[PDB]
Design a protein around this ligand. Structure first.
Ligand SMILES: C[C@@]1(CO)[C@H](O)CC[C@@]2(C)[C@H]1CC[C@H]1C[C@@H]3C[C@@]12CC[C@]3(O)CO
Length: 865
RNA sequence: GCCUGGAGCGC
DNA sequence: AGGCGCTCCAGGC
């Protein structure tokens, strides 16, 4: 008849105003224009689907007793037809008996069983979730959304190509896309899998807001954006990351642009559009968004500030057509990211801050710390105050705009550097969810979707969607450490994905483990692979295919970064599978399964520790899935043969679980459980090797210890692991420490190294014992004093100062700025030497002969007692 | 040691 | 807006 193709990226549903309809936004190829343009496809008539569970025996709801008559499918039909449909207003519907499996948390529901499937328009009323009757004890699917029913039934798993048959035109345009179309029923949409992903339109932006002179509004005075119209998600980022860009500045209401501004620009030839009013600016922006038509908008702290601000201002200034910031034509703007995630429907939002938190560790995720760590460059800062003063001289405004441009360019580079977009696609293509959601973070949901697809495809009824804490079960086993320094090589054996393998090994699934604190029994080896095991099995196969492809030759060179990305996404998925089992709010929550996994975990660890011991080998440490062996040897080649020897022995015990040589140490300083320092062997040629320092858990790697303490401690660590004689070392450490103590007293240590960082678990206002907590105290100051406001998740930087108020150190906390700018404030040198440096060095040198607590305190110039 | 509150490393 | 195990600090009993 007729058909068109399109690559979908995002989906949206308005249950309240447009039930039974799902809007899909993506890309269509236009041959005439030789480029892809945005497209919106409206899918209608996605019907509610219910599953009524027939009773074994008919019940009288008044007496609560069987009536002697057994139940047949027809009984359910009739009760629904006569008493249910009527009472709740359902004119039409289709029904049909179907067989469905079940394996979830509602008791008295058979593993397999017949059900009365009832399908009817989403426009007619929704039944109560607890609805019961004379012929049925429960009904599933009452609250299932259309998006879920559509994605599950059509087997759509993340962005991909769709074939839409019998497309229809619309009276009037419903979206801001270049092409629109409508499908009358969902079975008109099909997935096609042998066509590559089209490149997207990416737009990175940043803005500068300014607090208004009189009262408290935060106006947008400048916006910068970088853009690229052909950004592949299946290959390396384009160089450069953008092709075009634009800048728009405005002025608050008390200020006036510096004289000659327009002219100063005409000269420099900068694409800076100078707008008279904030409202004009906003409108300029919204139009570029509408004209550029990005598929993805990337920024920093978008969901935490920028986006909400942009929307509020758009409303106050009554800027024209706010819904263009999204892809669907809408009238009313919802607020508070709910109203936000909805505000941009059709366009994916990538917030680098969120993406960084999921990909790397830092002491803070502010743009400057990310730029430093990720891009390795310094990023200037502009305090909200200095802004106005910049409106007096043109060269200053131009600097401000240029800065904003630099910010958007950094955000774009970070996004490129972390490979966020390509990873997100692979992740979404695996979980089978929605990419804008994958980008918002939250693993539980990617997990839900993956399982929902798995169970749907295997004929199971699935759970209805339902409408730090203290541990709820046993975790991993942590062997007791034989603290101390070692000179002989150390063997580190590791299991490859213990948890995921445990799950396949012992066939642990919702469909195989009987369950009701009490670890359930493993299933009988006779039963077939459970649904969950098969899913992990698949991830493991695909990851093997990929690593094998990577070993290939005469290959397209860029393909290797691609395989590497998919490989990691396949790993992240499999591992999250476990953690979801243990999440109380997960749609597929199942503590029993989780706990059974960690159990066989501990068990296997011990049988392993024991076995290495029966081989007359010393086992000095072990954490959840690893075993550290002290060979007492000095012959590297022999060490390896030993490892491979133990290896062969353990791997002989299982069908899928495998242990391997994760490495070898030349020297190791084991302080406590989950805390050590070591020199790692990196073989080269002829049995030779180089050595690299690796730290784990020591205060040195934490963010809640100033750099002064961390740098000193690392020094001591380098010494300790060295080749020098024990005495050479002990001397060097003393030499150094005493120096540090002086440098601290004389004031030669940079004010930066005294900074301590801590992240707030709650919003600074939700802390009762406030005052006694440094970071929280400092956060309140910052919030109540200036612009941006610290909130849960944010890391606060501070330093202890001499107030001259005789309060404990924990009550004399200030911001680095509050220190250098204020005079009566001065670094509490005493605190840092005794409460920072000393503690760290003390705990590191504990197993060291020659070094002691009182001995260290004197070197720094402290009274031993 | 424990308790209360608060940190974030480890797998 | 996936888990649990193991230190560290401030303060007081
Ligand atoms: C945090 C979480 C939750 O599943 C996530 O998948 C990252 C890996 C994770 C930390 C896991 C919790 C259990 C951890 C044990 C380690 C690391 C681990 C996943 C399994 C392990 O790799 C050992 O099997």
């Amino acid at each position: 008849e007729q058909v068109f193709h399109f690559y979908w990226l995002d989906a949206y549903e308005d249950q309240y105003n447009q039930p039974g309809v799902v809007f899909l936004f993506g890309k269509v190829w236009i041959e005439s224009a030789e480029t892809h343009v945005s497209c919106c496809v409206m899918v209608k008539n996605i019907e509610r689907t219910l599953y009524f569970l027939p009773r074994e025996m008919k019940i009288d709801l008044n007496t609560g007793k069987e009536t002697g008559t057994p139940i047949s499918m027809k009984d359910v039909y009739e009760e629904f037809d006569e008493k249910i449909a009527t009472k709740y207003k359902i004119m039409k519907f289709k029904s049909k008996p179907v067989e469905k499996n079940y394996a979830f948390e509602i008791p008295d529901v058979p593993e397999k069983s017949e059900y009365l499937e009832v399908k009817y328009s989403a426009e007619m009323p929704q039944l109560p979730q607890d609805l019961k009757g004379e012929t049925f004890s429960h009904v599933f699917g009452t609250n299932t959304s259309s998006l879920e029913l559509f994605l599950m039934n059509r087997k759509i798993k993340g962005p991909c190509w769709l074939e839409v048959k019998s497309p229809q035109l619309l009276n009037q345009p419903v979206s801001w896309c270049k092409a629109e179309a409508m499908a009358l029923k969902p079975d008109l949409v099909n997935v096609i899998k042998d066509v590559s992903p089209p490149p997207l339109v990416v737009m990175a932006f940043s803005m500068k807001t300014m607090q208004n002179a009189k009262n408290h509004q935060n106006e947008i005075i400048a916006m910068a954006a970088l853009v690229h119209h052909s950004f592949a998600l299946d290959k390396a980022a384009p160089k450069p990351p953008f092709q075009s860009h634009f800048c728009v500045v405005s002025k608050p209401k008390d200020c006036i642009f510096p004289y000659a501004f327009k002219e100063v620009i005409e000269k420099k030839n900068v694409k800076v559009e100078v707008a008279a009013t904030e409202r004009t600016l906003l409108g300029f922006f919204l139009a570029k968004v509408h004209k550029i038509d990005p598929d993805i908008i990337v920024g920093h702290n978008i969901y935490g500030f920028e986006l909400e601000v942009l929307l509020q201002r758009i409303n106050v200034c009554k800027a024209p057509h706010w819904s263009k910031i999204g892809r669907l034509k809408r009238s009313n703007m919802p607020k508070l990211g709910f109203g936000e995630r909805n505000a941009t429907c059709g366009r994916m939002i990538c917030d680098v801050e969120i993406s960084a938190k999921e990909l790397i560790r830092c002491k803070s995720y502010h743009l400057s710390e990310l730029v430093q760590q990720i891009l390795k460059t310094e990023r200037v800062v502009i305090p909200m105050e200095n802004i106005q003063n910049m409106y007096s001289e043109s060269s200053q405004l131009l600097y401000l705009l240029e800065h904003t441009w630099k910010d958007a360019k950094f955000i774009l580079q970070i996004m490129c550097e972390l490979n966020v977009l390509p990873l997100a696609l692979q992740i979404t293509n695996i979980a089978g969810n929605i990419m804008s959601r994958t980008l918002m973070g939250g693993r539980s949901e990617r997990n839900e979707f993956l399982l929902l697809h798995a169970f749907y495809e295997n004929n199971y009824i699935v759970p209805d969607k339902q409408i730090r804490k203290k541990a709820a079960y046993a975790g991993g086993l942590v062997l007791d450490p034989k603290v101390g320094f070692y000179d002989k090589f150390i063997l580190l054996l590791d299991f490859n994905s213990l948890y995921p393998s445990i799950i396949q090994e012992f066939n642990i699934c919702f469909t195989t483990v009987q369950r009701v604190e009490q670890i359930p029994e493993l299933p009988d080896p006779s039963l077939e692979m459970g649904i969950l095991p098969r899913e992990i099995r698949k991830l493991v196969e695909r990851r093997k295919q990929v690593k094998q492809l990577m070993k290939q030759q005469d290959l397209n060179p860029d393909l290797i970064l691609q395989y590497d990305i998919r490989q990691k996404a396949l790993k992240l998925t499999a591992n999250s599978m476990y953690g979801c089992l243990g999440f109380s709010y997960s749609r597929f929550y199942a503590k029993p399964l989780a706990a059974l996994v960690t159990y066989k975990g501990r068990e296997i660890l011990m049988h392993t520790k024991e076995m290495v011991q029966k081989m007359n080998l010393e086992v000095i440490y072990g954490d959840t899935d690893s075993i550290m062996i002290n060979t007492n040897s000095t012959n590297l080649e022999e060490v390896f043969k030993l490892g491979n020897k133990v290896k062969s022995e353990v791997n002989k015990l299982y069908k899928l679980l495998e242990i391997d040589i994760d490495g070898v140490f030349k020297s190791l300083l084991l302080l406590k459980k989950k805390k050590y320092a070591a020199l790692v062997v990196e073989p080269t040629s002829d049995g030779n090797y180089v050595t690299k320092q690796e730290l784990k858990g020591l205060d040195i790697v934490r963010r809640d210890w100033c750099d002064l303490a961390k740098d000193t401690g690392n020094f001591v660590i380098g010494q300790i692991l060295s080749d020098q004689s024990r005495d050479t070392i002990v001397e060097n450490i003393q030499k150094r420490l005493i120096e540090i103590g002086e440098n601290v007293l004389n004031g030669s240590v940079p004010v930066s190294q005294f900074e301590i960082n801590k992240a707030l678990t709650k919003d600074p206002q939700d802390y009762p014992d406030k005052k006694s907590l440094p970071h929280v105290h400092v956060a309140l100051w910052i919030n109540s004093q200036g612009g941006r406001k610290v909130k849960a998740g944010d890391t606060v930087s501070y330093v202890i100062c001499q107030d001259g108020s005789n309060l404990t150190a924990s009550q004399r906390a200030y911001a680095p700025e509050q220190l250098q700018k204020q005079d009566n404030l001065t670094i509490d040198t005493q605190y840092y030497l005794a409460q920072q440096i000393h503690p760290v060095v003390a705990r590191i040198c504990e197993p060291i002969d020659g070094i002691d607590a009182v001995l260290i305190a004197t070197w720094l110039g402290l009274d031993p007692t």
